[PDB]
Design a protein around this nucleic acid. Structure first.
Ligand SMILES: [Mg+2]
Ligand SMILES: [Mg+2]
Ligand SMILES: [Mg+2]
Ligand SMILES: [Mg+2]
Ligand SMILES: [Mg+2]
Ligand SMILES: [Mg+2]
Ligand SMILES: [Mg+2]
Ligand SMILES: [Mg+2]
Ligand SMILES: [Mg+2]
Ligand SMILES: [Mg+2]
Ligand SMILES: [Mg+2]
Ligand SMILES: [Mg+2]
Ligand SMILES: [Mg+2]
Ligand SMILES: [Mg+2]
Ligand SMILES: [Mg+2]
Ligand SMILES: [Mg+2]
Ligand SMILES: [Mg+2]
Ligand SMILES: [Mg+2]
Ligand SMILES: [Mg+2]
Ligand SMILES: [Mg+2]
Ligand SMILES: [Mg+2]
Ligand SMILES: [Mg+2]
Ligand SMILES: [Mg+2]
Ligand SMILES: [Mg+2]
Ligand SMILES: [Mg+2]
Ligand SMILES: [Mg+2]
Ligand SMILES: [Mg+2]
Ligand SMILES: [Mg+2]
Ligand SMILES: [Mg+2]
Ligand SMILES: [Mg+2]
Ligand SMILES: [Mg+2]
Ligand SMILES: [Mg+2]
Ligand SMILES: [Mg+2]
Ligand SMILES: [Mg+2]
Ligand SMILES: [Mg+2]
Ligand SMILES: [Mg+2]
Ligand SMILES: [Mg+2]
Ligand SMILES: [Mg+2]
Ligand SMILES: [Mg+2]
Ligand SMILES: [Mg+2]
Ligand SMILES: [Mg+2]
Ligand SMILES: [Mg+2]
Ligand SMILES: [Mg+2]
Ligand SMILES: [Mg+2]
Ligand SMILES: [Mg+2]
Ligand SMILES: [Mg+2]
Ligand SMILES: [Mg+2]
Ligand SMILES: [Mg+2]
Ligand SMILES: [Mg+2]
Ligand SMILES: [Mg+2]
Ligand SMILES: [Mg+2]
Ligand SMILES: [Mg+2]
Ligand SMILES: [Mg+2]
Ligand SMILES: [Mg+2]
Ligand SMILES: [Mg+2]
Ligand SMILES: [Mg+2]
Ligand SMILES: [Mg+2]
Ligand SMILES: [Mg+2]
Ligand SMILES: [Mg+2]
Ligand SMILES: [Mg+2]
Ligand SMILES: [Mg+2]
Ligand SMILES: [Mg+2]
Ligand SMILES: [Mg+2]
Ligand SMILES: [Mg+2]
Ligand SMILES: [Mg+2]
Ligand SMILES: [Mg+2]
Ligand SMILES: [Mg+2]
Ligand SMILES: [Mg+2]
Lengths: 82, 157, 129, 121, 205, 80
RNA sequence: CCCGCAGAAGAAGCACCGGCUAACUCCGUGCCAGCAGCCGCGGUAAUACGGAGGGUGCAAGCGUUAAUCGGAAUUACUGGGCGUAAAGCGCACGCAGGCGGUUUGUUAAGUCAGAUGUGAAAUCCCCGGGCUCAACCUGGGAACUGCAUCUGAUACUGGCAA
RNA sequence: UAGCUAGUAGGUGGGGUAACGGCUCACCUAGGCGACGAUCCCUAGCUGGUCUGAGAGGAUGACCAGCCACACUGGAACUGA
């Protein structure tokens, strides 16, 4: 099962999540097909915070890929018309 | 237009019936800092007398060097005895990155920034001649234009 | 026993210039005339001919500007023991672009400067300072 | 030379042997020590240089120089060995580390005391 | 981390005035300057080619109060940056906060400016900064916080800055202890004595 | 088109199978000289069509023995 | 992370100083004791040994040891040599192999040009951004020097006919 | 380390494999690899990379990521996608 999940990079106490299309059996940080945007929870109100390429999501979710609990929330955060 | 300086001093012996007498050999290079160079060897019984005797020869034994702005025209070899010497033009940044003896002759000549390297032996006398053989040999685009009888722009561009 | 004829041409030119000789006879060819014409066209050699029907003898006429010879240095690059084919962007520039490198390209023999602008590479025959 | 000759037999890189066979790129090595003794150097020197045979832990049997003035080494006594030739005793190609293990520091030293393993006054 | 030794000793070894103990008084005349580095001060040095490079490096270090590890890192930044390697070395040194605080006139010496930066007094773009090494970017506004504003050390130190040359690249208000760093410093604006070329030579080998 | 390879035959004395050398003129990584390197494949053929010493075209296909994964396409220029 | 006291208060070593290589004197010792990365220092006036003062260089690190590359153009493809320094087999014949005079063809293997796919991400590199600054993290770009296929070019090299 | 090699090298037919195949058998032919280094011996996880270098190269493959291999030593299969 392909799944869209966060990778968790960044320093200690300073997380930065690379949202990524990967197989369920492969490790969190390990093998993936292709990365599809990112997430930064310690970004705050500034220029950049979260980005998510919605075109590549249609190629995977449309075919057959689950979306993880946190990545499903960021598709709601980026919105369709807000 | 002096810009004179000393590369090396070195004591040399003779050996006679009595014992052995020691003279000193200087090696100075002089230049205007604008495409004129001249090495002078000079030897004498005492050290400071040897450097004047060298400096007098260095002034007369002068060579012209056609150079671009503050650097060479093209990469150039200049062999002499056991010293190969190579030196590339380089850009408007940087400085003279070259060995001692080889960079005394370059800085007084008026090249501000060049790559360089002495292969083979690195005897101060021979590497200074090796450079000046290179810089004498080193032709400019204005020379090459007239040599073939074509055009300054058509060759360069 | 006469393996590279093109190098032998370039020695006759080099050794003619050292001896302060006016003209330089040698056996002709297709590739000899192509190189000799490129050297003439830019201006290392001052005219040439190909006199002969059965056994042709291409003779050059060397140039001298001062007491010094015009061809400062001339050497074979792509010798038969080791063929050297360079790509478009990797083509050399002799003496930082004031000497030439004769390069046999697909659109005939030409200079390295012409090969850049034409937009192609080939066998680099000889550097000429 | 000759490019064809090189294709047939490439350039053999000169595998320069190491000066100090202590093996496996080790900084130092333990030594049980046997025969502590004095030896005379080469020509222009003349002295009684303090030196010991060292039964190393890996199996080797090497001489090692004992730096400083005076030492506690005798018969056995487990010591530590670092690299470095003396260039005077021909054959001796190691130095005992003063301070480490049974080899004590040099007595009454002030200048350069990391070498010779002595603490502050 | 710092020198914290005899500071005027460093000036005699170098020869020229380093502005280490510039302080309230203008000219010293209280050390036998030039002709007494140490015990053997009368000894005229031969001074080799490596010597003159090292003396020039150590001069620029001791003026700006930087150690070799941090100083060599400025060279590594200077080489990668555009333009001239020599001009960048010194441009990055002048961009330090402890140096800018000295040049504004909030400190009689550079060590006093360094302590002022370090002890929560200095503040830039509405943010407190403790680091002397803080690279002050173009178009900034360094200033003193209102708790430590108009204390005894700063008011006397600002009167000294009137006698100084005063840089063109930065500007000072002087009433409310407020500074304004404007552009990057040019070569020809400052010094006109410390050679950069010799320091580029020392590190290239 | 099909990804064929030209090559000269070394031997055909195996019954319904042929060994073929492919001369490839690659250059040496270090020294720059062009070497005449060889690749000896085993190839399948229906009957004893091709003999010794002749040019042959060969295709990559299914593995049909231990070795011998290549297969004959056609003959071009027969033996002298 | 922010204020709140308090008082310079709790917070500096350890290499080196004969040439290479930045920095010198004085005592002790007398080819002894010892130093040494290379040359080399010590035989009763030691700048090199031991101590002392003084200096220089780094500084919460400093040195020593080991390990790799560099400098080493001292395995040289870029880029070395072989009369006397190390180095032409004692001299021939010769298969495999390397190389091959010259003019037409003709293919397109090499070679060259273009195009598409790929060369995982990180790393490196450049312009940004985020941690008080930096290291660190991080967006985009370039790059990944390649390999494959596909279409051309025919000068050169090869194959092939005269 | 100069010859190695008898299921060895190929065929026809049967079995077996998720799948093709000396994968494995029965017979048939006498091959196959080899100086562009087989066989044998010693050493070694491999790569992205890392360090170094002007670059070519040289060295290396701790940490992060991909692949392989192994699980007390030597075997075998069962279960299951
Ligand atoms: Mg797996
Ligand atoms: Mg949040
Ligand atoms: Mg006499
Ligand atoms: Mg040499
Ligand atoms: Mg390309
Ligand atoms: Mg003796
Ligand atoms: Mg620190
Ligand atoms: Mg004080
Ligand atoms: Mg460098
Ligand atoms: Mg095709
Ligand atoms: Mg193809
Ligand atoms: Mg606080
Ligand atoms: Mg308080
Ligand atoms: Mg107080
Ligand atoms: Mg108080
Ligand atoms: Mg204290
Ligand atoms: Mg005695
Ligand atoms: Mg004496
Ligand atoms: Mg004395
Ligand atoms: Mg001493
Ligand atoms: Mg001291
Ligand atoms: Mg350390
Ligand atoms: Mg090395
Ligand atoms: Mg090398
Ligand atoms: Mg060579
Ligand atoms: Mg040699
Ligand atoms: Mg001899
Ligand atoms: Mg000999
Ligand atoms: Mg012979
Ligand atoms: Mg002979
Ligand atoms: Mg032989
Ligand atoms: Mg033959
Ligand atoms: Mg042939
Ligand atoms: Mg031919
Ligand atoms: Mg021909
Ligand atoms: Mg065609
Ligand atoms: Mg082709
Ligand atoms: Mg090709
Ligand atoms: Mg191509
Ligand atoms: Mg990548
Ligand atoms: Mg950045
Ligand atoms: Mg920031
Ligand atoms: Mg910043
Ligand atoms: Mg980083
Ligand atoms: Mg990034
Ligand atoms: Mg990226
Ligand atoms: Mg790209
Ligand atoms: Mg045609
Ligand atoms: Mg043709
Ligand atoms: Mg042809
Ligand atoms: Mg299954
Ligand atoms: Mg198989
Ligand atoms: Mg690098
Ligand atoms: Mg580098
Ligand atoms: Mg190199
Ligand atoms: Mg490896
Ligand atoms: Mg591990
Ligand atoms: Mg760990
Ligand atoms: Mg892990
Ligand atoms: Mg696999
Ligand atoms: Mg597998
Ligand atoms: Mg197992
Ligand atoms: Mg397993
Ligand atoms: Mg286990
Ligand atoms: Mg198990
Ligand atoms: Mg088991
Ligand atoms: Mg088991
Ligand atoms: Mg089930």
């Amino acid at each position: 099962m392909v799944t869209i999940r966060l990778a968790r990079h960044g320093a200690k106490k300073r997380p930065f999540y690379q949202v990524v299309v990967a197989d369920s059996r492969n490790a969190r940080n390990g093998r993936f097909i292709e990365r599809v945007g990112f997430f930064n929870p310690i970004a705050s109100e500034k220029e950049e915070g979260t980005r998510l390429d919605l075109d590549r999501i249609a190629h995977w979710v449309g075919q057959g890929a689950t979306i993880s609990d946190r990545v499903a929330a960021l598709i709601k955060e980026v919105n369709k018309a807000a | 237009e002096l810009q004179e300086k000393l590369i090396a001093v070195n004591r040399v012996s003779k050996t006679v019936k009595g014992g052995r007498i020691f003279s000193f050999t200087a090696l100075t290079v002089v230049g205007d800092g604008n495409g004129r160079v001249g090495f002078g060897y000079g030897k004498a019984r005492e050290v400071p007398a040897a450097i004047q005797k060298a400096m007098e020869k260095a002034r007369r034994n002068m060579i012209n060097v056609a150079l671009n702005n503050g650097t060479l025209q093209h990469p150039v070899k200049g062999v002499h005895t056991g010293s190969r010497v190579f030196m590339q033009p380089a850009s408007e940044g940087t400085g003279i990155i070259a060995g001692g003896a080889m960079r005394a002759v370059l800085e007084v000549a008026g090249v501000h920034n060049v790559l360089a390297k002495a292969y083979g032996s690195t005897n101060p006398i021979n590497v200074v001649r090796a450079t000046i053989d290179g810089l004498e040999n080193m032709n400019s685009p204005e020379m090459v234009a007239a040599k073939r009888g074509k055009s300054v722009e058509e060759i360069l561009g | 026993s006469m393996q590279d004829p093109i190098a032998d041409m370039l020695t006759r030119i080099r050794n003619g210039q050292a001896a302060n000789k006016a003209a330089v006879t040698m056996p002709s060819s297709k590739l000899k005339v192509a190189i000799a014409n490129v050297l003439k066209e830019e201006g290392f050699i001052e005219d040439f001919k190909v006199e002969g029907d059965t056994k042709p003898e291409l003779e050059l006429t060397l140039k001298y500007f001062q007491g010094k010879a015009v061809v400062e240095s001339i050497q074979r690059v792509s010798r038969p023991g080791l063929r050297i084919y360079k790509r478009k962007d990797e083509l050399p520039k002799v003496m930082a672009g004031l000497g030439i490198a004769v390069v046999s390209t697909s659109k005939g023999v030409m200079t390295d400067r012409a090969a850049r602008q034409a937009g192609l590479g080939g066998e680099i025959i000889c550097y000429v300072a | 030379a000759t490019v064809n000759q090189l294709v047939r037999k490439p350039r053999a890189r000169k595998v320069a042997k190491s000066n100090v066979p202590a093996l496996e790129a080790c900084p130092q090595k333990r030594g049980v020590c046997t025969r502590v003794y004095t030896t005379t150097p080469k020509k222009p020197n003349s002295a009684l240089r303090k030196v010991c045979r060292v039964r190393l832990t890996n199996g080797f049997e090497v001489t090692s120089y004992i730096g400083g003035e005076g030492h506690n080494l005798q018969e056995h006594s487990v010591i530590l060995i670092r690299g470095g030739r003396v260039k005077d005793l021909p054959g001796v190609r190691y130095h005992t580390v003063r301070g480490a293990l049974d080899c004590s520091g040099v007595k009454d030293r002030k200048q350069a005391r990391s070498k010779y393993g002595v603490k502050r006054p | 981390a710092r020198y914290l030794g005899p500071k005027l000793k460093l000036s005699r070894r170098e020869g020229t005035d380093l502005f280490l103990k510039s302080g309230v008084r203008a000219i010293d005349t209280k050390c036998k300057i030039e002709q007494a580095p140490g015990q053997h001060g009368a000894r005229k040095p031969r001074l080799s080619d490596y010597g003159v490079q090292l003396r020039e490096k150590q001069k620029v270090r001791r003026i700006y109060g930087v150690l070799e590890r941090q100083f060599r890192n400025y060279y590594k930044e200077a080489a990668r940056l555009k333009g001239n390697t020599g001009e960048n070395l010194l441009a990055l040194l002048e961009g330090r906060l402890d140096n800018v605080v000295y040049r504004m006139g909030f400190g009689a010496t550079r060590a006093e400016a360094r302590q002022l930066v370090s002890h929560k007094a200095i503040m830039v773009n509405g943010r407190v900064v403790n680091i002397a090494s803080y690279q002050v970017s173009p178009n900034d506004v360094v200033s003193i916080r209102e708790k430590a504003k108009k204390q005894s050390r700063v008011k006397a130190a600002l009167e000294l800055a009137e006698q100084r040359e005063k840089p063109t690249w930065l500007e000072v208000d002087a009433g409310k202890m407020e500074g304004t760093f404007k552009r990057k410093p040019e070569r020809s604006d400052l010094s006109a004595d410390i050679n950069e070329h010799l320091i580029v030579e020392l590190y290239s080998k | 088109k099909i990804r064929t390879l030209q090559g000269r035959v070394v031997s055909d004395k195996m019954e319904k199978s042929i060994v073929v050398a492919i001369e490839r003129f690659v250059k040496h990584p270090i020294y720059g000289k062009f070497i005449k390197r060889t690749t000896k494949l085993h190839v399948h053929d229906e009957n004893n069509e091709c003999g010794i010493g002749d040019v042959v075209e060969i295709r990559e296909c299914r593995p049909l023995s231990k070795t011998k994964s290549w297969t004959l396409v056609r003959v071009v220029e027969k033996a002298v």
